[PDB]
Design a protein around this ligand. Sequence first.
Ligand SMILES: CCCCCCCCO[C@@H]1O[C@H](CO)[C@@H](O)[C@H](O)[C@H]1O
Ligand SMILES: CCCCCCCCO[C@@H]1O[C@H](CO)[C@@H](O)[C@H](O)[C@H]1O
Lengths: 122, 122, 122, 122
Amino acid sequence: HLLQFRKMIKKMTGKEPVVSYAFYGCYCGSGGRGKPKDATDRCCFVHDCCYEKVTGCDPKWDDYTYSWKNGTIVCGGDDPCKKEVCECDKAAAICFRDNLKTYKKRYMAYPDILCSSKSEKC
Amino acid sequence: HLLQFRKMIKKMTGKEPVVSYAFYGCYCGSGGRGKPKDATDRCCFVHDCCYEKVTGCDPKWDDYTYSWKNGTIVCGGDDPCKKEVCECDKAAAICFRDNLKTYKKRYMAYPDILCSSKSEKC
Amino acid sequence: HLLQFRKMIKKMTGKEPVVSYAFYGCYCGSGGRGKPKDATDRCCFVHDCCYEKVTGCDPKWDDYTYSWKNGTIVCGGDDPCKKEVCECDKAAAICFRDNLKTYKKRYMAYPDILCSSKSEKC
Amino acid sequence: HLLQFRKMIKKMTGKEPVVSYAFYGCYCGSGGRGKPKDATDRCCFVHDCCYEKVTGCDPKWDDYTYSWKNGTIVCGGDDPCKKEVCECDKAAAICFRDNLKTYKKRYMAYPDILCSSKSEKC
Ligand SMILES: CCCCCCCCO[C@@H]1O[C@H](CO)[C@@H](O)[C@H](O)[C@H]1O
Ligand SMILES: CCCCCCCCO[C@@H]1O[C@H](CO)[C@@H](O)[C@H](O)[C@H]1O
Protein backbone atom coordinates (compact mmCIF):
# COMPACT_ATOMS: atom_id res chain seq x y z
CA HIS A 1 0.00 0.00 0.00
CA LEU A 2 1.11 3.55 -0.75
CA LEU A 3 0.44 4.46 2.89
CA GLN A 4 3.01 1.88 4.00
CA PHE A 5 5.44 3.06 1.36
CA ARG A 6 4.95 6.55 2.74
CA LYS A 7 5.96 5.42 6.23
CA MET A 8 9.13 3.84 4.84
CA ILE A 9 10.19 7.02 3.04
CA LYS A 10 9.47 9.16 6.10
CA LYS A 11 11.62 7.07 8.45
CA MET A 12 14.48 6.65 5.99
CA THR A 13 14.38 10.22 4.74
CA GLY A 14 12.95 12.33 7.54
CA LYS A 15 10.73 14.19 5.07
CA GLU A 16 6.96 14.25 4.60
CA PRO A 17 6.58 12.04 1.47
CA VAL A 18 3.33 13.65 0.34
CA VAL A 19 5.01 17.06 0.18
CA SER A 20 8.57 16.11 -0.83
CA TYR A 21 8.12 13.08 -3.17
CA ALA A 22 4.52 12.77 -4.36
CA PHE A 23 5.11 15.30 -7.15
CA TYR A 24 8.87 15.23 -7.60
CA GLY A 25 10.35 15.29 -11.11
CA CYS A 26 8.81 13.39 -14.01
CA TYR A 27 8.28 9.97 -12.47
CA CYS A 28 7.54 10.35 -8.77
CA GLY A 29 4.07 11.73 -9.39
CA SER A 30 1.38 9.43 -10.75
CA GLY A 31 2.54 7.61 -13.85
CA GLY A 32 5.66 9.06 -15.44
CA ARG A 33 6.97 10.46 -18.71
CA GLY A 34 10.14 11.45 -20.52
CA LYS A 35 13.58 11.20 -18.99
CA PRO A 36 14.24 11.17 -15.22
CA LYS A 37 15.27 14.65 -14.07
CA ASP A 38 17.85 13.46 -11.52
CA ALA A 39 18.96 10.71 -9.12
CA THR A 40 15.89 10.96 -6.89
CA ASP A 41 13.67 10.95 -9.98
CA ARG A 42 15.47 7.83 -11.15
CA CYS A 43 14.47 6.17 -7.90
CA CYS A 44 10.84 6.73 -8.91
CA PHE A 45 11.50 5.61 -12.47
CA VAL A 46 12.89 2.31 -11.18
CA HIS A 47 10.10 1.94 -8.62
CA ASP A 48 7.69 2.48 -11.52
CA CYS A 49 9.39 -0.32 -13.44
CA CYS A 50 9.12 -2.44 -10.31
CA TYR A 51 5.34 -2.05 -9.90
CA GLU A 52 4.83 -2.93 -13.57
CA LYS A 53 6.53 -6.32 -13.11
CA VAL A 54 4.09 -7.16 -10.30
CA THR A 55 1.27 -9.31 -11.71
CA GLY A 56 -0.53 -11.28 -9.02
CA CYS A 57 -1.68 -8.34 -6.86
CA ASP A 58 -2.25 -4.58 -6.58
CA PRO A 59 1.00 -2.79 -5.63
CA LYS A 60 -0.86 0.44 -5.03
CA TRP A 61 -3.71 -0.67 -2.81
CA ASP A 62 -2.65 -4.07 -1.48
CA ASP A 63 -1.32 -4.20 2.05
CA TYR A 64 1.86 -6.15 2.68
CA THR A 65 3.61 -7.09 5.91
CA TYR A 66 6.99 -5.72 6.94
CA SER A 67 9.08 -4.83 10.00
CA TRP A 68 11.97 -2.54 10.95
CA LYS A 69 14.27 -5.32 12.20
CA ASN A 70 17.51 -3.52 13.07
CA GLY A 71 16.88 -0.10 11.57
CA THR A 72 16.25 -1.81 8.24
CA ILE A 73 12.92 -2.57 6.60
CA VAL A 74 12.27 -6.30 6.38
CA CYS A 75 9.50 -7.60 4.16
CA GLY A 76 7.74 -10.78 5.26
CA GLY A 77 4.58 -12.79 4.68
CA ASP A 78 3.81 -15.97 2.73
CA ASP A 79 2.40 -14.04 -0.22
CA PRO A 80 5.17 -13.69 -2.83
CA CYS A 81 3.25 -10.98 -4.67
CA LYS A 82 2.68 -8.62 -1.76
CA LYS A 83 6.23 -9.27 -0.57
CA GLU A 84 7.31 -8.52 -4.14
CA VAL A 85 5.71 -5.08 -3.96
CA CYS A 86 7.12 -4.55 -0.46
CA GLU A 87 10.60 -4.93 -1.88
CA CYS A 88 9.83 -2.41 -4.61
CA ASP A 89 8.96 0.11 -1.90
CA LYS A 90 11.85 -0.80 0.39
CA ALA A 91 14.29 -0.27 -2.46
CA ALA A 92 12.75 3.09 -3.40
CA ALA A 93 12.87 4.43 0.16
CA ILE A 94 16.54 3.45 0.40
CA CYS A 95 17.10 5.01 -3.02
CA PHE A 96 15.71 8.32 -1.79
CA ARG A 97 17.91 8.13 1.30
CA ASP A 98 21.11 7.54 -0.64
CA ASN A 99 20.43 10.41 -3.02
CA LEU A 100 19.10 12.90 -0.47
CA LYS A 101 22.31 14.87 -1.07
CA THR A 102 21.27 15.62 -4.67
CA TYR A 103 17.64 16.48 -3.82
CA LYS A 104 16.58 19.71 -5.56
CA LYS A 105 13.58 21.72 -4.38
CA ARG A 106 13.16 23.14 -7.86
CA TYR A 107 12.10 19.63 -8.84
CA MET A 108 9.31 18.94 -6.35
CA ALA A 109 5.97 19.86 -7.91
CA TYR A 110 7.63 19.74 -11.36
CA PRO A 111 5.18 20.34 -14.26
CA ASP A 112 4.87 17.20 -16.38
CA ILE A 113 4.29 19.23 -19.55
CA LEU A 114 7.99 20.06 -19.31
CA CYS A 115 9.01 16.38 -19.34
CA SER A 116 10.77 14.99 -22.42
CA SER A 117 8.61 13.55 -25.21
CA LYS A 118 10.55 10.28 -25.48
CA SER A 119 10.30 8.22 -22.32
CA GLU A 120 13.10 5.98 -21.06
CA LYS A 121 12.45 2.23 -21.10
CA CYS A 122 12.49 -0.05 -18.08
CA HIS B 1 3.65 22.10 -31.82
CA LEU B 2 0.82 21.53 -29.37
CA LEU B 3 -0.74 24.82 -30.51
CA GLN B 4 -1.02 23.45 -34.06
CA PHE B 5 -2.39 20.18 -32.76
CA ARG B 6 -4.95 22.24 -30.87
CA LYS B 7 -6.13 23.91 -34.07
CA MET B 8 -6.58 20.51 -35.74
CA ILE B 9 -8.71 19.15 -32.90
CA LYS B 10 -10.84 22.30 -32.81
CA LYS B 11 -11.67 22.23 -36.53
CA MET B 12 -12.28 18.48 -36.61
CA THR B 13 -14.17 18.35 -33.33
CA GLY B 14 -15.71 21.78 -32.86
CA LYS B 15 -14.66 21.79 -29.20
CA GLU B 16 -12.11 23.88 -27.31
CA PRO B 17 -9.24 21.38 -26.94
CA VAL B 18 -7.83 22.98 -23.78
CA VAL B 19 -11.15 22.46 -22.00
CA SER B 20 -12.39 19.22 -23.56
CA TYR B 21 -9.20 17.18 -24.19
CA ALA B 22 -6.26 18.59 -22.23
CA PHE B 23 -7.31 16.67 -19.10
CA TYR B 24 -9.48 13.87 -20.48
CA GLY B 25 -9.19 10.36 -19.06
CA CYS B 26 -5.84 8.85 -18.10
CA TYR B 27 -3.76 9.61 -21.20
CA CYS B 28 -4.91 12.90 -22.72
CA GLY B 29 -3.40 14.97 -19.93
CA SER B 30 0.36 15.21 -19.67
CA GLY B 31 2.03 11.82 -19.69
CA GLY B 32 -0.36 8.95 -19.03
CA ARG B 33 -0.95 5.98 -16.75
CA GLY B 34 -2.94 2.79 -16.35
CA LYS B 35 -5.54 1.66 -18.85
CA PRO B 36 -7.34 3.99 -21.28
CA LYS B 37 -10.77 4.87 -19.91
CA ASP B 38 -12.52 4.84 -23.28
CA ALA B 39 -12.29 5.33 -27.05
CA THR B 40 -11.32 8.99 -26.87
CA ASP B 41 -8.76 8.17 -24.17
CA ARG B 42 -7.38 5.48 -26.48
CA CYS B 43 -6.82 8.21 -29.06
CA CYS B 44 -4.51 9.92 -26.58
CA PHE B 45 -2.86 6.66 -25.63
CA VAL B 46 -1.98 6.01 -29.28
CA HIS B 47 -0.90 9.62 -29.81
CA ASP B 48 1.35 9.16 -26.79
CA CYS B 49 2.87 6.08 -28.38
CA CYS B 50 3.30 8.10 -31.54
CA TYR B 51 5.31 10.92 -29.94
CA GLU B 52 7.58 8.36 -28.24
CA LYS B 53 8.63 6.92 -31.61
CA VAL B 54 9.70 10.37 -32.81
CA THR B 55 13.47 10.72 -32.35
CA GLY B 56 14.95 13.47 -34.50
CA CYS B 57 12.90 16.39 -33.15
CA ASP B 58 10.62 17.76 -30.42
CA PRO B 59 6.98 16.71 -31.03
CA LYS B 60 5.75 19.03 -28.34
CA TRP B 61 7.48 22.27 -29.19
CA ASP B 62 8.64 21.88 -32.79
CA ASP B 63 6.57 23.59 -35.44
CA TYR B 64 5.64 21.58 -38.53
CA THR B 65 3.96 22.63 -41.75
CA TYR B 66 0.48 21.46 -42.78
CA SER B 67 -2.58 22.55 -44.77
CA TRP B 68 -6.30 21.84 -44.90
CA LYS B 69 -6.36 20.71 -48.54
CA ASN B 70 -9.97 19.64 -49.13
CA GLY B 71 -11.34 19.63 -45.59
CA THR B 72 -8.53 17.24 -44.62
CA ILE B 73 -5.29 18.02 -42.85
CA VAL B 74 -2.28 17.53 -45.09
CA CYS B 75 1.20 17.41 -43.61
CA GLY B 76 4.06 18.73 -45.73
CA GLY B 77 7.64 19.93 -45.51
CA ASP B 78 10.99 18.33 -46.30
CA ASP B 79 11.68 17.46 -42.68
CA PRO B 80 10.66 13.83 -42.10
CA CYS B 81 10.73 14.26 -38.33
CA LYS B 82 8.43 17.29 -38.08
CA LYS B 83 6.16 15.72 -40.70
CA GLU B 84 6.26 12.55 -38.60
CA VAL B 85 4.91 14.44 -35.60
CA CYS B 86 2.37 16.19 -37.81
CA GLU B 87 0.93 12.81 -38.74
CA CYS B 88 0.73 11.85 -35.06
CA ASP B 89 -1.43 14.91 -34.46
CA LYS B 90 -3.50 14.54 -37.63
CA ALA B 91 -4.35 10.98 -36.65
CA ALA B 92 -5.31 11.97 -33.08
CA ALA B 93 -7.60 14.78 -34.20
CA ILE B 94 -9.37 12.39 -36.59
CA CYS B 95 -9.50 9.83 -33.78
CA PHE B 96 -11.31 12.33 -31.56
CA ARG B 97 -13.74 13.14 -34.35
CA ASP B 98 -14.66 9.52 -35.02
CA ASN B 99 -15.30 8.77 -31.35
CA LEU B 100 -17.06 12.03 -30.48
CA LYS B 101 -20.22 9.95 -30.08
CA THR B 102 -18.72 8.12 -27.08
CA TYR B 103 -17.30 11.25 -25.43
CA LYS B 104 -18.16 11.32 -21.72
CA LYS B 105 -18.06 14.55 -19.71
CA ARG B 106 -17.47 12.53 -16.56
CA TYR B 107 -14.06 11.79 -18.03
CA MET B 108 -12.74 15.28 -18.76
CA ALA B 109 -10.66 16.49 -15.80
CA TYR B 110 -10.38 12.87 -14.63
CA PRO B 111 -8.16 12.40 -11.52
CA ASP B 112 -5.03 10.43 -12.41
CA ILE B 113 -4.85 8.88 -8.96
CA LEU B 114 -7.85 6.82 -10.04
CA CYS B 115 -6.02 5.40 -13.05
CA SER B 116 -5.04 1.71 -13.04
CA SER B 117 -1.67 0.75 -11.55
CA LYS B 118 -0.61 -1.36 -14.53
CA SER B 119 -0.21 0.71 -17.68
CA GLU B 120 -0.93 -0.64 -21.16
CA LYS B 121 2.04 -1.00 -23.50
CA CYS B 122 2.44 0.71 -26.85
CA HIS C 1 0.89 22.91 9.97
CA LEU C 2 -0.71 21.52 6.83
CA LEU C 3 -0.02 18.00 8.14
CA GLN C 4 -2.18 18.70 11.19
CA PHE C 5 -4.85 20.28 9.03
CA ARG C 6 -4.77 17.12 6.96
CA LYS C 7 -5.47 14.97 10.01
CA MET C 8 -8.48 17.14 10.91
CA ILE C 9 -10.02 16.82 7.45
CA LYS C 10 -9.45 13.07 7.41
CA LYS C 11 -11.19 12.42 10.73
CA MET C 12 -14.08 14.82 10.01
CA THR C 13 -14.49 13.78 6.40
CA GLY C 14 -13.24 10.20 6.14
CA LYS C 15 -11.38 11.03 2.93
CA GLU C 16 -7.69 11.24 2.11
CA PRO C 17 -7.15 15.04 2.02
CA VAL C 18 -4.20 14.90 -0.37
CA VAL C 19 -6.34 13.11 -2.97
CA SER C 20 -9.79 14.64 -2.34
CA TYR C 21 -9.04 18.27 -1.34
CA ALA C 22 -5.48 19.28 -2.23
CA PHE C 23 -6.51 20.08 -5.81
CA TYR C 24 -10.27 20.67 -5.51
CA GLY C 25 -11.88 23.54 -7.39
CA CYS C 26 -10.23 26.95 -7.74
CA TYR C 27 -9.19 27.65 -4.16
CA CYS C 28 -8.32 24.38 -2.43
CA GLY C 29 -5.10 23.95 -4.35
CA SER C 30 -2.19 26.27 -3.65
CA GLY C 31 -3.22 29.91 -3.82
CA GLY C 32 -6.57 30.48 -5.50
CA ARG C 33 -8.21 32.37 -8.35
CA GLY C 34 -11.55 33.45 -9.77
CA LYS C 35 -14.86 32.47 -8.22
CA PRO C 36 -15.34 29.44 -5.93
CA LYS C 37 -16.79 26.54 -7.92
CA ASP C 38 -19.08 25.28 -5.15
CA ALA C 39 -19.69 24.95 -1.41
CA THR C 40 -16.59 22.86 -0.73
CA ASP C 41 -14.52 25.28 -2.80
CA ARG C 42 -15.94 28.13 -0.73
CA CYS C 43 -14.58 26.37 2.37
CA CYS C 44 -11.12 26.75 0.85
CA PHE C 45 -11.77 30.32 -0.23
CA VAL C 46 -12.67 31.23 3.35
CA HIS C 47 -9.74 29.25 4.77
CA ASP C 48 -7.53 31.19 2.34
CA CYS C 49 -8.91 34.43 3.70
CA CYS C 50 -8.26 33.11 7.17
CA TYR C 51 -4.57 32.41 6.61
CA GLU C 52 -4.10 35.89 5.12
CA LYS C 53 -5.29 37.54 8.33
CA VAL C 54 -2.67 35.64 10.35
CA THR C 55 0.34 37.91 10.87
CA GLY C 56 2.50 36.76 13.78
CA CYS C 57 3.35 33.27 12.50
CA ASP C 58 3.43 30.84 9.57
CA PRO C 59 0.01 29.16 9.10
CA LYS C 60 1.45 26.71 6.59
CA TRP C 61 4.52 25.44 8.42
CA ASP C 62 3.99 26.36 12.06
CA ASP C 63 2.84 23.63 14.40
CA TYR C 64 -0.03 24.39 16.73
CA THR C 65 -1.49 22.37 19.59
CA TYR C 66 -4.98 20.88 19.53
CA SER C 67 -7.02 17.96 20.86
CA TRP C 68 -10.15 15.99 19.97
CA LYS C 69 -12.01 16.67 23.22
CA ASN C 70 -15.42 15.04 22.71
CA GLY C 71 -15.31 14.26 18.99
CA THR C 72 -14.61 17.94 18.34
CA ILE C 73 -11.29 19.59 17.58
CA VAL C 74 -10.16 21.88 20.38
CA CYS C 75 -7.36 24.34 19.79
CA GLY C 76 -5.12 25.18 22.74
CA GLY C 77 -1.76 26.70 23.60
CA ASP C 78 -0.64 30.09 24.92
CA ASP C 79 0.35 31.33 21.47
CA PRO C 80 -2.56 33.38 20.04
CA CYS C 81 -1.09 33.23 16.54
CA LYS C 82 -0.71 29.46 16.27
CA LYS C 83 -4.09 29.01 17.94
CA GLU C 84 -5.42 31.51 15.42
CA VAL C 85 -4.28 29.33 12.54
CA CYS C 86 -5.59 26.24 14.33
CA GLU C 87 -9.06 27.76 14.27
CA CYS C 88 -8.76 28.50 10.55
CA ASP C 89 -8.08 24.80 9.98
CA LYS C 90 -10.73 23.57 12.43
CA ALA C 91 -13.33 25.68 10.67
CA ALA C 92 -12.29 24.44 7.22
CA ALA C 93 -12.45 20.76 8.20
CA ILE C 94 -15.95 21.26 9.63
CA CYS C 95 -16.83 23.19 6.48
CA PHE C 96 -15.83 20.21 4.34
CA ARG C 97 -17.86 17.88 6.57
CA ASP C 98 -21.05 19.94 6.35
CA ASN C 99 -20.90 20.20 2.55
CA LEU C 100 -19.75 16.63 1.85
CA LYS C 101 -23.21 16.11 0.34
CA THR C 102 -22.44 18.57 -2.48
CA TYR C 103 -18.92 17.26 -3.13
CA LYS C 104 -18.39 16.76 -6.90
CA LYS C 105 -15.65 14.48 -8.23
CA ARG C 106 -15.58 16.50 -11.44
CA TYR C 107 -14.08 19.26 -9.32
CA MET C 108 -11.13 17.51 -7.70
CA ALA C 109 -8.02 18.10 -9.81
CA TYR C 110 -9.82 21.04 -11.47
CA PRO C 111 -7.61 22.97 -13.97
CA ASP C 112 -6.93 26.49 -12.71
CA ILE C 113 -6.77 27.89 -16.25
CA LEU C 114 -10.52 27.39 -16.28
CA CYS C 115 -11.05 29.57 -13.21
CA SER C 116 -12.75 32.96 -13.63
CA SER C 117 -10.53 35.96 -14.39
CA LYS C 118 -12.04 38.15 -11.65
CA SER C 119 -11.38 36.77 -8.19
CA GLU C 120 -13.78 37.17 -5.29
CA LYS C 121 -12.63 39.33 -2.38
CA CYS C 122 -12.24 38.20 1.21
CA HIS D 1 -6.50 36.39 -25.04
CA LEU D 2 -3.71 34.39 -23.41
CA LEU D 3 -2.77 33.08 -26.86
CA GLN D 4 -2.08 36.63 -28.05
CA PHE D 5 -0.18 37.39 -24.85
CA ARG D 6 1.88 34.29 -25.57
CA LYS D 7 2.84 35.59 -29.01
CA MET D 8 3.98 38.90 -27.47
CA ILE D 9 6.23 37.20 -24.93
CA LYS D 10 7.70 34.92 -27.58
CA LYS D 11 8.68 37.74 -29.93
CA MET D 12 10.01 39.99 -27.17
CA THR D 13 11.75 37.22 -25.27
CA GLY D 14 12.60 34.54 -27.81
CA LYS D 15 11.42 31.82 -25.43
CA GLU D 16 8.46 29.44 -25.52
CA PRO D 17 6.08 31.10 -23.02
CA VAL D 18 4.28 27.87 -22.10
CA VAL D 19 7.57 26.30 -21.01
CA SER D 20 9.46 29.30 -19.63
CA TYR D 21 6.74 31.50 -18.03
CA ALA D 22 3.51 29.53 -17.54
CA PHE D 23 4.78 28.09 -14.24
CA TYR D 24 7.48 30.57 -13.21
CA GLY D 25 7.78 31.61 -9.57
CA CYS D 26 4.74 32.31 -7.39
CA TYR D 27 2.68 34.56 -9.65
CA CYS D 28 3.25 33.56 -13.28
CA GLY D 29 1.28 30.37 -12.97
CA SER D 30 -2.48 30.54 -12.53
CA GLY D 31 -3.47 32.86 -9.71
CA GLY D 32 -0.60 33.76 -7.40
CA ARG D 33 0.43 33.68 -3.76
CA GLY D 34 2.95 35.02 -1.28
CA LYS D 35 5.81 37.28 -2.28
CA PRO D 36 7.23 37.49 -5.82
CA LYS D 37 10.39 35.39 -6.06
CA ASP D 38 12.27 37.79 -8.35
CA ALA D 39 12.08 40.48 -11.05
CA THR D 40 10.44 38.22 -13.63
CA ASP D 41 7.98 37.00 -10.99
CA ARG D 42 7.20 40.63 -10.20
CA CYS D 43 6.24 41.10 -13.85
CA CYS D 44 3.56 38.46 -13.33
CA PHE D 45 2.51 39.92 -10.00
CA VAL D 46 1.93 43.31 -11.68
CA HIS D 47 0.21 41.70 -14.68
CA ASP D 48 -2.02 39.94 -12.15
CA CYS D 49 -2.88 43.28 -10.58
CA CYS D 50 -3.57 44.58 -14.06
CA TYR D 51 -6.11 41.89 -14.98
CA GLU D 52 -7.95 42.46 -11.69
CA LYS D 53 -8.56 46.13 -12.53
CA VAL D 54 -10.23 45.14 -15.82
CA THR D 55 -14.00 45.09 -15.33
CA GLY D 56 -15.89 45.35 -18.62
CA CYS D 57 -14.47 42.22 -20.30
CA ASP D 58 -12.59 38.94 -19.94
CA PRO D 59 -8.80 39.52 -19.98
CA LYS D 60 -8.13 35.79 -20.20
CA TRP D 61 -10.43 34.76 -23.04
CA ASP D 62 -11.33 37.99 -24.83
CA ASP D 63 -9.51 38.74 -28.06
CA TYR D 64 -8.08 42.23 -28.52
CA THR D 65 -6.52 43.86 -31.55
CA TYR D 66 -2.87 44.86 -31.73
CA SER D 67 0.02 45.32 -34.19
CA TRP D 68 3.81 45.32 -34.17
CA LYS D 69 4.23 48.83 -35.57
CA ASN D 70 8.00 49.41 -35.56
CA GLY D 71 9.19 46.44 -33.52
CA THR D 72 6.85 47.55 -30.73
CA ILE D 73 3.46 46.16 -29.83
CA VAL D 74 0.69 48.65 -30.46
CA CYS D 75 -2.77 48.07 -29.03
CA GLY D 76 -5.73 49.35 -31.02
CA GLY D 77 -9.48 48.98 -31.34
CA ASP D 78 -12.45 51.06 -30.21
CA ASP D 79 -13.10 48.84 -27.20
CA PRO D 80 -11.42 50.46 -24.16
CA CYS D 81 -11.73 47.24 -22.14
CA LYS D 82 -10.05 44.89 -24.59
CA LYS D 83 -7.45 47.56 -25.30
CA GLU D 84 -7.04 47.84 -21.54
CA VAL D 85 -6.15 44.16 -21.27
CA CYS D 86 -3.91 44.45 -24.33
CA GLU D 87 -1.82 47.00 -22.47
CA CYS D 88 -1.58 44.70 -19.45
CA ASP D 89 -0.10 42.06 -21.74
CA LYS D 90 2.14 44.46 -23.66
CA ALA D 91 3.62 45.72 -20.40
CA ALA D 92 4.22 42.19 -19.06
CA ALA D 93 5.99 41.03 -22.22
CA ILE D 94 8.26 44.08 -22.06
CA CYS D 95 8.77 43.39 -18.37
CA PHE D 96 10.00 39.89 -19.13
CA ARG D 97 12.33 41.25 -21.80
CA ASP D 98 13.95 43.82 -19.52
CA ASN D 99 14.57 41.31 -16.75
CA LEU D 100 15.64 38.38 -18.92
CA LYS D 101 19.11 38.90 -17.46
CA THR D 102 17.88 37.85 -14.00
CA TYR D 103 15.83 34.87 -15.23
CA LYS D 104 16.52 31.81 -13.05
CA LYS D 105 15.75 28.30 -14.30
CA ARG D 106 15.41 27.13 -10.72
CA TYR D 107 12.26 29.23 -10.63
CA MET D 108 10.37 27.90 -13.63
CA ALA D 109 8.00 25.15 -12.46
CA TYR D 110 8.33 26.51 -8.90
CA PRO D 111 6.14 24.66 -6.34
CA ASP D 112 3.45 27.01 -5.00
CA ILE D 113 3.42 25.25 -1.61
CA LEU D 114 6.78 26.92 -1.04
CA CYS D 115 5.36 30.39 -1.61
CA SER D 116 5.09 32.75 1.37
CA SER D 117 1.89 32.67 3.44
CA LYS D 118 1.36 36.44 3.35
CA SER D 119 0.71 37.72 -0.15
CA GLU D 120 1.82 41.15 -1.36
CA LYS D 121 -0.93 43.63 -2.18
CA CYS D 122 -1.50 45.28 -5.53
C1 LIG E 1 -6.42 21.58 1.55
C2 LIG E 1 -5.87 20.20 1.95
C3 LIG E 1 -4.36 20.25 2.13
C4 LIG E 1 -3.80 18.87 2.47
C5 LIG E 1 -2.28 18.83 2.32
C6 LIG E 1 -1.89 18.84 0.84
C7 LIG E 1 -0.37 18.84 0.67
C8 LIG E 1 -0.02 18.82 -0.82
O1 LIG E 1 -0.45 20.05 -1.43
C9 LIG E 1 -0.28 20.18 -2.80
O2 LIG E 1 1.13 20.20 -3.09
C10 LIG E 1 1.40 20.22 -4.51
C11 LIG E 1 2.90 20.09 -4.70
O3 LIG E 1 3.55 19.63 -3.52
C12 LIG E 1 0.82 21.50 -5.14
O4 LIG E 1 0.98 21.44 -6.56
C13 LIG E 1 -0.68 21.64 -4.80
O5 LIG E 1 -1.13 22.92 -5.21
C14 LIG E 1 -0.92 21.48 -3.29
O6 LIG E 1 -2.31 21.45 -3.01
C1 LIG F 1 -2.06 28.22 -22.80
C2 LIG F 1 -1.57 29.67 -22.87
C3 LIG F 1 -0.45 29.98 -21.86
C4 LIG F 1 0.16 31.34 -22.21
C5 LIG F 1 1.40 31.67 -21.38
C6 LIG F 1 0.99 32.40 -20.12
C7 LIG F 1 2.22 32.79 -19.30
C8 LIG F 1 1.81 32.90 -17.83
O1 LIG F 1 0.77 33.89 -17.72
C9 LIG F 1 -0.21 33.66 -16.75
O2 LIG F 1 -1.17 32.75 -17.28
C10 LIG F 1 -2.21 32.48 -16.34
C11 LIG F 1 -2.83 31.16 -16.75
O3 LIG F 1 -1.87 30.09 -16.71
C12 LIG F 1 -3.14 33.68 -16.26
O4 LIG F 1 -4.16 33.42 -15.32
C13 LIG F 1 -2.33 34.92 -15.83
O5 LIG F 1 -3.05 36.08 -16.23
C14 LIG F 1 -0.88 35.01 -16.39
O6 LIG F 1 -0.06 35.63 -15.40
